[PDB]
PDB file of all heavy atoms in Angstrom:
ATOM      1  N   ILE A  67      -2.998  21.535 -17.119  1.00 52.04           N
ATOM      2  CA  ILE A  67      -2.838  20.172 -16.568  1.00 52.04           C
ATOM      3  C   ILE A  67      -1.341  19.832 -16.422  1.00 52.04           C
ATOM      4  O   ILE A  67      -0.923  19.338 -15.366  1.00 52.04           O
ATOM      5  CB  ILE A  67      -3.658  19.073 -17.335  1.00 52.04           C
ATOM      6  CG1 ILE A  67      -5.167  19.442 -17.398  1.00 52.04           C
ATOM      7  CG2 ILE A  67      -3.462  17.667 -16.703  1.00 52.04           C
ATOM      8  CD1 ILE A  67      -6.038  18.646 -18.398  1.00 52.04           C
ATOM      9  N   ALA A  68      -0.551  20.130 -17.466  1.00 48.99           N
ATOM     10  CA  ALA A  68       0.900  19.911 -17.466  1.00 48.99           C
ATOM     11  C   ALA A  68       1.547  20.730 -16.337  1.00 48.99           C
ATOM     12  O   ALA A  68       2.338  20.170 -15.569  1.00 48.99           O
ATOM     13  CB  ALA A  68       1.496  20.292 -18.818  1.00 48.99           C
ATOM     14  N   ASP A  69       1.122  22.009 -16.165  1.00 46.91           N
ATOM     15  CA  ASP A  69       1.621  22.885 -15.087  1.00 46.91           C
ATOM     16  C   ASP A  69       1.325  22.310 -13.685  1.00 46.91           C
ATOM     17  O   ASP A  69       2.193  22.388 -12.803  1.00 46.91           O
ATOM     18  CB  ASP A  69       1.049  24.312 -15.199  1.00 46.91           C
ATOM     19  CG  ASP A  69       1.669  25.200 -16.260  1.00 46.91           C
ATOM     20  OD1 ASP A  69       2.789  24.885 -16.723  1.00 46.91           O
ATOM     21  OD2 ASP A  69       1.046  26.231 -16.609  1.00 46.91           O
ATOM     22  N   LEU A  70       0.102  21.752 -13.472  1.00 48.94           N
ATOM     23  CA  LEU A  70      -0.221  21.166 -12.165  1.00 48.94           C
ATOM     24  C   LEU A  70       0.678  19.948 -11.887  1.00 48.94           C
ATOM     25  O   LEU A  70       1.142  19.762 -10.767  1.00 48.94           O
ATOM     26  CB  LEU A  70      -1.711  20.822 -12.046  1.00 48.94           C
ATOM     27  CG  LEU A  70      -2.151  20.075 -10.758  1.00 48.94           C
ATOM     28  CD1 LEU A  70      -1.981  20.948  -9.509  1.00 48.94           C
ATOM     29  CD2 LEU A  70      -3.607  19.589 -10.865  1.00 48.94           C
ATOM     30  N   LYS A  71       0.967  19.139 -12.918  1.00 48.51           N
ATOM     31  CA  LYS A  71       1.844  17.991 -12.720  1.00 48.51           C
ATOM     32  C   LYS A  71       3.290  18.434 -12.331  1.00 48.51           C
ATOM     33  O   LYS A  71       3.913  17.795 -11.473  1.00 48.51           O
ATOM     34  CB  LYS A  71       1.808  17.056 -13.953  1.00 48.51           C
ATOM     35  CG  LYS A  71       0.486  16.277 -14.062  1.00 48.51           C
ATOM     36  CD  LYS A  71       0.330  15.605 -15.427  1.00 48.51           C
ATOM     37  CE  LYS A  71      -1.013  14.931 -15.534  1.00 48.51           C
ATOM     38  NZ  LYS A  71      -1.229  14.358 -16.888  1.00 48.51           N
ATOM     39  N   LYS A  72       3.773  19.566 -12.909  1.00 49.24           N
ATOM     40  CA  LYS A  72       5.096  20.135 -12.596  1.00 49.24           C
ATOM     41  C   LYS A  72       5.111  20.688 -11.169  1.00 49.24           C
ATOM     42  O   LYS A  72       6.064  20.432 -10.448  1.00 49.24           O
ATOM     43  CB  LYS A  72       5.529  21.210 -13.600  1.00 49.24           C
ATOM     44  CG  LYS A  72       5.953  20.625 -14.962  1.00 49.24           C
ATOM     45  CD  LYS A  72       6.418  21.740 -15.927  1.00 49.24           C
ATOM     46  CE  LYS A  72       5.268  22.434 -16.634  1.00 49.24           C
ATOM     47  NZ  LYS A  72       5.720  23.584 -17.472  1.00 49.24           N
ATOM     48  N   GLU A  73       3.987  21.336 -10.740  1.00 49.33           N
ATOM     49  CA  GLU A  73       3.767  21.855  -9.376  1.00 49.33           C
ATOM     50  C   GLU A  73       3.821  20.721  -8.336  1.00 49.33           C
ATOM     51  O   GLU A  73       4.458  20.865  -7.291  1.00 49.33           O
ATOM     52  CB  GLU A  73       2.404  22.577  -9.327  1.00 49.33           C
ATOM     53  CG  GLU A  73       2.021  23.106  -7.957  1.00 49.33           C
ATOM     54  CD  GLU A  73       0.674  23.789  -7.902  1.00 49.33           C
ATOM     55  OE1 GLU A  73       0.021  23.943  -8.959  1.00 49.33           O
ATOM     56  OE2 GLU A  73       0.266  24.169  -6.785  1.00 49.33           O
ATOM     57  N   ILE A  74       3.110  19.599  -8.603  1.00 51.09           N
ATOM     58  CA  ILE A  74       3.059  18.422  -7.733  1.00 51.09           C
ATOM     59  C   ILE A  74       4.473  17.853  -7.547  1.00 51.09           C
ATOM     60  O   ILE A  74       4.858  17.544  -6.421  1.00 51.09           O
ATOM     61  CB  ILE A  74       2.096  17.349  -8.345  1.00 51.09           C
ATOM     62  CG1 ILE A  74       0.635  17.758  -8.142  1.00 51.09           C
ATOM     63  CG2 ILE A  74       2.364  15.932  -7.779  1.00 51.09           C
ATOM     64  CD1 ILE A  74      -0.361  16.987  -9.024  1.00 51.09           C
ATOM     65  N   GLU A  75       5.256  17.740  -8.644  1.00 51.31           N
ATOM     66  CA  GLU A  75       6.590  17.173  -8.536  1.00 51.31           C
ATOM     67  C   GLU A  75       7.540  18.125  -7.782  1.00 51.31           C
ATOM     68  O   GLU A  75       8.444  17.651  -7.097  1.00 51.31           O
ATOM     69  CB  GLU A  75       7.120  16.720  -9.909  1.00 51.31           C
ATOM     70  CG  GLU A  75       8.405  15.898  -9.843  1.00 51.31           C
ATOM     71  CD  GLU A  75       8.394  14.641  -8.995  1.00 51.31           C
ATOM     72  OE1 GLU A  75       7.304  14.072  -8.766  1.00 51.31           O
ATOM     73  OE2 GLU A  75       9.489  14.223  -8.556  1.00 51.31           O
ATOM     74  N   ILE A  76       7.270  19.461  -7.821  1.00 49.02           N
ATOM     75  CA  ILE A  76       8.069  20.425  -7.057  1.00 49.02           C
ATOM     76  C   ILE A  76       7.803  20.237  -5.559  1.00 49.02           C
ATOM     77  O   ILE A  76       8.745  20.045  -4.783  1.00 49.02           O
ATOM     78  CB  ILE A  76       7.820  21.874  -7.517  1.00 49.02           C
ATOM     79  CG1 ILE A  76       8.444  22.090  -8.925  1.00 49.02           C
ATOM     80  CG2 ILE A  76       8.359  22.897  -6.470  1.00 49.02           C
ATOM     81  CD1 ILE A  76       7.991  23.319  -9.686  1.00 49.02           C
ATOM     82  N   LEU A  77       6.514  20.244  -5.176  1.00 47.98           N
ATOM     83  CA  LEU A  77       6.144  20.154  -3.772  1.00 47.98           C
ATOM     84  C   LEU A  77       6.506  18.822  -3.136  1.00 47.98           C
ATOM     85  O   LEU A  77       6.869  18.788  -1.954  1.00 47.98           O
ATOM     86  CB  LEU A  77       4.648  20.445  -3.588  1.00 47.98           C
ATOM     87  CG  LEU A  77       4.219  20.664  -2.116  1.00 47.98           C
ATOM     88  CD1 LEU A  77       5.056  21.792  -1.436  1.00 47.98           C
ATOM     89  CD2 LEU A  77       2.754  20.953  -2.041  1.00 47.98           C
ATOM     90  N   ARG A  78       6.420  17.724  -3.924  1.00 45.53           N
ATOM     91  CA  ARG A  78       6.730  16.364  -3.464  1.00 45.53           C
ATOM     92  C   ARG A  78       8.160  16.312  -2.908  1.00 45.53           C
ATOM     93  O   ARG A  78       8.441  15.542  -1.981  1.00 45.53           O
ATOM     94  CB  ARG A  78       6.563  15.371  -4.632  1.00 45.53           C
ATOM     95  CG  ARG A  78       6.594  13.895  -4.241  1.00 45.53           C
ATOM     96  CD  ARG A  78       6.416  12.966  -5.451  1.00 45.53           C
ATOM     97  NE  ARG A  78       7.639  12.821  -6.252  1.00 45.53           N
ATOM     98  CZ  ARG A  78       8.649  12.007  -5.943  1.00 45.53           C
ATOM     99  NH1 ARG A  78       8.628  11.308  -4.810  1.00 45.53           N
ATOM    100  NH2 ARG A  78       9.707  11.920  -6.741  1.00 45.53           N
ATOM    101  N   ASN A  79       9.046  17.151  -3.463  1.00 45.05           N
ATOM    102  CA  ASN A  79      10.455  17.157  -3.091  1.00 45.05           C
ATOM    103  C   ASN A  79      10.885  18.332  -2.193  1.00 45.05           C
ATOM    104  O   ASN A  79      12.088  18.486  -1.952  1.00 45.05           O
ATOM    105  CB  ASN A  79      11.317  17.062  -4.345  1.00 45.05           C
ATOM    106  CG  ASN A  79      11.137  15.761  -5.078  1.00 45.05           C
ATOM    107  OD1 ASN A  79      11.743  14.742  -4.727  1.00 45.05           O
ATOM    108  ND2 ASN A  79      10.259  15.751  -6.084  1.00 45.05           N
ATOM    109  N   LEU A  80       9.924  19.114  -1.637  1.00 43.24           N
ATOM    110  CA  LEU A  80      10.284  20.196  -0.718  1.00 43.24           C
ATOM    111  C   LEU A  80       9.915  19.743   0.699  1.00 43.24           C
ATOM    112  O   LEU A  80       8.766  19.349   0.937  1.00 43.24           O
ATOM    113  CB  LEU A  80       9.533  21.508  -1.036  1.00 43.24           C
ATOM    114  CG  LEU A  80       9.746  22.173  -2.401  1.00 43.24           C
ATOM    115  CD1 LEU A  80       8.851  23.409  -2.546  1.00 43.24           C
ATOM    116  CD2 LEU A  80      11.177  22.583  -2.607  1.00 43.24           C
ATOM    117  N   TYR A  81      10.863  19.844   1.640  1.00 41.22           N
ATOM    118  CA  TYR A  81      10.662  19.486   3.059  1.00 41.22           C
ATOM    119  C   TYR A  81      11.211  20.587   3.936  1.00 41.22           C
ATOM    120  O   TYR A  81      12.433  20.732   4.047  1.00 41.22           O
ATOM    121  CB  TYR A  81      11.404  18.172   3.406  1.00 41.22           C
ATOM    122  CG  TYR A  81      11.060  17.005   2.521  1.00 41.22           C
ATOM    123  CD1 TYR A  81      11.885  16.646   1.456  1.00 41.22           C
ATOM    124  CD2 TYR A  81       9.971  16.186   2.807  1.00 41.22           C
ATOM    125  CE1 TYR A  81      11.596  15.538   0.662  1.00 41.22           C
ATOM    126  CE2 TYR A  81       9.677  15.071   2.024  1.00 41.22           C
ATOM    127  CZ  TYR A  81      10.489  14.753   0.949  1.00 41.22           C
ATOM    128  OH  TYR A  81      10.194  13.645   0.187  1.00 41.22           O
ATOM    129  N   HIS A  82      10.328  21.411   4.509  1.00 43.63           N
ATOM    130  CA  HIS A  82      10.736  22.516   5.395  1.00 43.63           C
ATOM    131  C   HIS A  82       9.568  22.829   6.334  1.00 43.63           C
ATOM    132  O   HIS A  82       8.422  22.802   5.905  1.00 43.63           O
ATOM    133  CB  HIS A  82      11.135  23.763   4.593  1.00 43.63           C
ATOM    134  CG  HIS A  82      11.684  24.871   5.440  1.00 43.63           C
ATOM    135  ND1 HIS A  82      11.032  25.808   6.161  1.00 43.63           N
ATOM    136  CD2 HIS A  82      13.046  25.087   5.553  1.00 43.63           C
ATOM    137  CE1 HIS A  82      11.986  26.591   6.755  1.00 43.63           C
ATOM    138  NE2 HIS A  82      13.178  26.126   6.364  1.00 43.63           N
ATOM    139  N   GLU A  83       9.856  23.150   7.611  1.00 44.95           N
ATOM    140  CA  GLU A  83       8.814  23.461   8.596  1.00 44.95           C
ATOM    141  C   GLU A  83       7.887  24.648   8.199  1.00 44.95           C
ATOM    142  O   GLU A  83       6.738  24.683   8.635  1.00 44.95           O
ATOM    143  CB  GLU A  83       9.394  23.656  10.013  1.00 44.95           C
ATOM    144  CG  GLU A  83      10.393  24.782  10.189  1.00 44.95           C
ATOM    145  CD  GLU A  83      10.925  24.837  11.609  1.00 44.95           C
ATOM    146  OE1 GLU A  83      11.734  23.953  11.975  1.00 44.95           O
ATOM    147  OE2 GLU A  83      10.517  25.749  12.363  1.00 44.95           O
ATOM    148  N   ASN A  84       8.357  25.559   7.334  1.00 45.36           N
ATOM    149  CA  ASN A  84       7.571  26.693   6.841  1.00 45.36           C
ATOM    150  C   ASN A  84       7.108  26.536   5.378  1.00 45.36           C
ATOM    151  O   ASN A  84       6.859  27.541   4.702  1.00 45.36           O
ATOM    152  CB  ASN A  84       8.316  28.000   7.064  1.00 45.36           C
ATOM    153  CG  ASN A  84       8.606  28.189   8.524  1.00 45.36           C
ATOM    154  OD1 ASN A  84       9.869  28.199   8.838  1.00 45.36           O
ATOM    155  ND2 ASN A  84       7.696  28.291   9.373  1.00 45.36           N
ATOM    156  N   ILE A  85       6.982  25.274   4.896  1.00 46.05           N
ATOM    157  CA  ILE A  85       6.438  24.943   3.572  1.00 46.05           C
ATOM    158  C   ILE A  85       5.324  23.899   3.809  1.00 46.05           C
ATOM    159  O   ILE A  85       5.560  22.914   4.501  1.00 46.05           O
ATOM    160  CB  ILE A  85       7.526  24.439   2.570  1.00 46.05           C
ATOM    161  CG1 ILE A  85       8.503  25.596   2.259  1.00 46.05           C
ATOM    162  CG2 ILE A  85       6.885  23.824   1.271  1.00 46.05           C
ATOM    163  CD1 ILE A  85       9.651  25.273   1.440  1.00 46.05           C
ATOM    164  N   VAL A  86       4.130  24.133   3.274  1.00 43.86           N
ATOM    165  CA  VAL A  86       2.981  23.217   3.418  1.00 43.86           C
ATOM    166  C   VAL A  86       3.381  21.773   3.017  1.00 43.86           C
ATOM    167  O   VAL A  86       4.133  21.567   2.050  1.00 43.86           O
ATOM    168  CB  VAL A  86       1.721  23.730   2.664  1.00 43.86           C
ATOM    169  CG1 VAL A  86       1.911  23.656   1.140  1.00 43.86           C
ATOM    170  CG2 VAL A  86       0.456  22.960   3.090  1.00 43.86           C
ATOM    171  N   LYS A  87       2.933  20.798   3.806  1.00 43.66           N
ATOM    172  CA  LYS A  87       3.302  19.413   3.601  1.00 43.66           C
ATOM    173  C   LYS A  87       2.558  18.745   2.474  1.00 43.66           C
ATOM    174  O   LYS A  87       1.322  18.743   2.440  1.00 43.66           O
ATOM    175  CB  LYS A  87       3.137  18.613   4.910  1.00 43.66           C
ATOM    176  CG  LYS A  87       4.225  18.915   5.942  1.00 43.66           C
ATOM    177  CD  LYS A  87       3.965  18.189   7.263  1.00 43.66           C
ATOM    178  CE  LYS A  87       5.084  18.442   8.254  1.00 43.66           C
ATOM    179  NZ  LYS A  87       4.810  17.808   9.570  1.00 43.66           N
ATOM    180  N   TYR A  88       3.316  18.180   1.540  1.00 42.49           N
ATOM    181  CA  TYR A  88       2.760  17.333   0.473  1.00 42.49           C
ATOM    182  C   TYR A  88       2.297  16.045   1.193  1.00 42.49           C
ATOM    183  O   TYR A  88       3.032  15.549   2.065  1.00 42.49           O
ATOM    184  CB  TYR A  88       3.911  16.942  -0.500  1.00 42.49           C
ATOM    185  CG  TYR A  88       3.603  15.807  -1.459  1.00 42.49           C
ATOM    186  CD1 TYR A  88       3.062  16.058  -2.712  1.00 42.49           C
ATOM    187  CD2 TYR A  88       3.927  14.486  -1.141  1.00 42.49           C
ATOM    188  CE1 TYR A  88       2.783  15.025  -3.599  1.00 42.49           C
ATOM    189  CE2 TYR A  88       3.655  13.446  -2.023  1.00 42.49           C
ATOM    190  CZ  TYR A  88       3.120  13.727  -3.272  1.00 42.49           C
ATOM    191  OH  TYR A  88       2.860  12.744  -4.196  1.00 42.49           O
ATOM    192  N   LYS A  89       1.109  15.510   0.812  1.00 42.70           N
ATOM    193  CA  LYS A  89       0.562  14.227   1.290  1.00 42.70           C
ATOM    194  C   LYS A  89       0.528  13.195   0.152  1.00 42.70           C
ATOM    195  O   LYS A  89       0.927  12.057   0.359  1.00 42.70           O
ATOM    196  CB  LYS A  89      -0.807  14.395   1.965  1.00 42.70           C
ATOM    197  CG  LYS A  89      -0.642  15.038   3.352  1.00 42.70           C
ATOM    198  CD  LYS A  89      -1.950  15.150   4.101  1.00 42.70           C
ATOM    199  CE  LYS A  89      -2.213  13.965   4.994  1.00 42.70           C
ATOM    200  NZ  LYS A  89      -1.253  13.866   6.134  1.00 42.70           N
ATOM    201  N   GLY A  90       0.096  13.594  -1.024  1.00 44.59           N
ATOM    202  CA  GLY A  90       0.087  12.688  -2.166  1.00 44.59           C
ATOM    203  C   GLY A  90      -0.738  13.159  -3.323  1.00 44.59           C
ATOM    204  O   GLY A  90      -0.904  14.373  -3.537  1.00 44.59           O
ATOM    205  N   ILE A  91      -1.213  12.200  -4.114  1.00 40.86           N
ATOM    206  CA  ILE A  91      -2.034  12.462  -5.312  1.00 40.86           C
ATOM    207  C   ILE A  91      -3.287  11.601  -5.393  1.00 40.86           C
ATOM    208  O   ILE A  91      -3.320  10.519  -4.830  1.00 40.86           O
ATOM    209  CB  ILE A  91      -1.188  12.263  -6.617  1.00 40.86           C
ATOM    210  CG1 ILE A  91      -0.565  10.851  -6.656  1.00 40.86           C
ATOM    211  CG2 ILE A  91      -0.107  13.368  -6.727  1.00 40.86           C
ATOM    212  CD1 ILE A  91       0.179  10.443  -8.050  1.00 40.86           C
ATOM    213  N   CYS A  92      -4.271  12.071  -6.180  1.00 42.52           N
ATOM    214  CA  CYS A  92      -5.450  11.317  -6.566  1.00 42.52           C
ATOM    215  C   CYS A  92      -5.484  11.382  -8.106  1.00 42.52           C
ATOM    216  O   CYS A  92      -5.650  12.463  -8.663  1.00 42.52           O
ATOM    217  CB  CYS A  92      -6.734  11.854  -5.947  1.00 42.52           C
ATOM    218  SG  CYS A  92      -8.200  10.873  -6.394  1.00 42.52           S
ATOM    219  N   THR A  93      -5.222  10.250  -8.784  1.00 43.93           N
ATOM    220  CA  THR A  93      -5.193  10.219 -10.264  1.00 43.93           C
ATOM    221  C   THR A  93      -6.529   9.774 -10.837  1.00 43.93           C
ATOM    222  O   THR A  93      -7.191   8.921 -10.250  1.00 43.93           O
ATOM    223  CB  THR A  93      -4.028   9.367 -10.788  1.00 43.93           C
ATOM    224  OG1 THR A  93      -4.159   8.036 -10.288  1.00 43.93           O
ATOM    225  CG2 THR A  93      -2.646   9.945 -10.422  1.00 43.93           C
ATOM    226  N   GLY A  99      -5.970  13.373 -15.817  1.00 41.65           N
ATOM    227  CA  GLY A  99      -6.470  14.125 -14.672  1.00 41.65           C
ATOM    228  C   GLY A  99      -5.733  13.779 -13.393  1.00 41.65           C
ATOM    229  O   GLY A  99      -5.383  12.614 -13.179  1.00 41.65           O
ATOM    230  N   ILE A 100      -5.487  14.794 -12.528  1.00 38.92           N
ATOM    231  CA  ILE A 100      -4.754  14.588 -11.266  1.00 38.92           C
ATOM    232  C   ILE A 100      -5.175  15.625 -10.228  1.00 38.92           C
ATOM    233  O   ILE A 100      -5.551  16.736 -10.581  1.00 38.92           O
ATOM    234  CB  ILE A 100      -3.219  14.592 -11.532  1.00 38.92           C
ATOM    235  CG1 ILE A 100      -2.427  13.941 -10.376  1.00 38.92           C
ATOM    236  CG2 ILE A 100      -2.680  16.002 -11.898  1.00 38.92           C
ATOM    237  CD1 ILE A 100      -0.939  13.592 -10.727  1.00 38.92           C
ATOM    238  N   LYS A 101      -5.081  15.260  -8.951  1.00 36.33           N
ATOM    239  CA  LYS A 101      -5.389  16.143  -7.830  1.00 36.33           C
ATOM    240  C   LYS A 101      -4.206  16.091  -6.884  1.00 36.33           C
ATOM    241  O   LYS A 101      -3.655  15.007  -6.656  1.00 36.33           O
ATOM    242  CB  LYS A 101      -6.650  15.680  -7.075  1.00 36.33           C
ATOM    243  CG  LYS A 101      -7.976  15.834  -7.857  1.00 36.33           C
ATOM    244  CD  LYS A 101      -9.142  15.212  -7.057  1.00 36.33           C
ATOM    245  CE  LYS A 101     -10.369  14.860  -7.885  1.00 36.33           C
ATOM    246  NZ  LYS A 101     -11.181  16.058  -8.218  1.00 36.33           N
ATOM    247  N   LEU A 102      -3.790  17.266  -6.364  1.00 36.90           N
ATOM    248  CA  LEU A 102      -2.686  17.385  -5.408  1.00 36.90           C
ATOM    249  C   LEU A 102      -3.294  17.346  -4.011  1.00 36.90           C
ATOM    250  O   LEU A 102      -4.205  18.118  -3.736  1.00 36.90           O
ATOM    251  CB  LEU A 102      -1.940  18.723  -5.662  1.00 36.90           C
ATOM    252  CG  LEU A 102      -0.973  19.317  -4.612  1.00 36.90           C
ATOM    253  CD1 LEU A 102       0.120  18.351  -4.199  1.00 36.90           C
ATOM    254  CD2 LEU A 102      -0.245  20.474  -5.200  1.00 36.90           C
ATOM    255  N   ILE A 103      -2.801  16.447  -3.136  1.00 39.48           N
ATOM    256  CA  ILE A 103      -3.303  16.288  -1.768  1.00 39.48           C
ATOM    257  C   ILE A 103      -2.256  16.857  -0.782  1.00 39.48           C
ATOM    258  O   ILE A 103      -1.092  16.446  -0.822  1.00 39.48           O
ATOM    259  CB  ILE A 103      -3.621  14.790  -1.450  1.00 39.48           C
ATOM    260  CG1 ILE A 103      -4.361  14.070  -2.621  1.00 39.48           C
ATOM    261  CG2 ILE A 103      -4.361  14.624  -0.118  1.00 39.48           C
ATOM    262  CD1 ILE A 103      -5.654  14.657  -3.110  1.00 39.48           C
ATOM    263  N   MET A 104      -2.677  17.777   0.112  1.00 40.31           N
ATOM    264  CA  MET A 104      -1.780  18.405   1.084  1.00 40.31           C
ATOM    265  C   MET A 104      -2.395  18.390   2.464  1.00 40.31           C
ATOM    266  O   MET A 104      -3.601  18.185   2.593  1.00 40.31           O
ATOM    267  CB  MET A 104      -1.484  19.889   0.672  1.00 40.31           C
ATOM    268  CG  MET A 104      -0.739  20.038  -0.675  1.00 40.31           C
ATOM    269  SD  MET A 104      -0.872  21.694  -1.407  1.00 40.31           S
ATOM    270  CE  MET A 104      -2.598  21.718  -1.994  1.00 40.31           C
ATOM    271  N   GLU A 105      -1.590  18.687   3.490  1.00 42.04           N
ATOM    272  CA  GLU A 105      -2.127  18.806   4.841  1.00 42.04           C
ATOM    273  C   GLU A 105      -3.144  19.941   4.871  1.00 42.04           C
ATOM    274  O   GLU A 105      -3.019  20.889   4.082  1.00 42.04           O
ATOM    275  CB  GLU A 105      -1.003  19.049   5.872  1.00 42.04           C
ATOM    276  CG  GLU A 105      -0.200  20.327   5.656  1.00 42.04           C
ATOM    277  CD  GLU A 105       0.835  20.654   6.714  1.00 42.04           C
ATOM    278  OE1 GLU A 105       0.710  20.147   7.853  1.00 42.04           O
ATOM    279  OE2 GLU A 105       1.780  21.412   6.396  1.00 42.04           O
TER     280      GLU A 105
END
Side-chain angles (χ1 to χ4, degrees):
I67 305 166
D69 283 342
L70 175 66
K71 288 167 184 176
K72 286 182 278 175
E73 177 181 356
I74 285 164
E75 190 56 24
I76 289 164
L77 192 55
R78 191 180 78 81
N79 296 278
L80 299 177
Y81 306 99
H82 186 278
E83 61 182 73
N84 301 116
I85 294 175
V86 70
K87 286 175 177 177
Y88 166 91
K89 286 184 93 67
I91 56 172
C92 182
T93 59
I100 199 166
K101 291 174 200 283
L102 164 55
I103 317 303
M104 297 161 287
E105 61 175 338

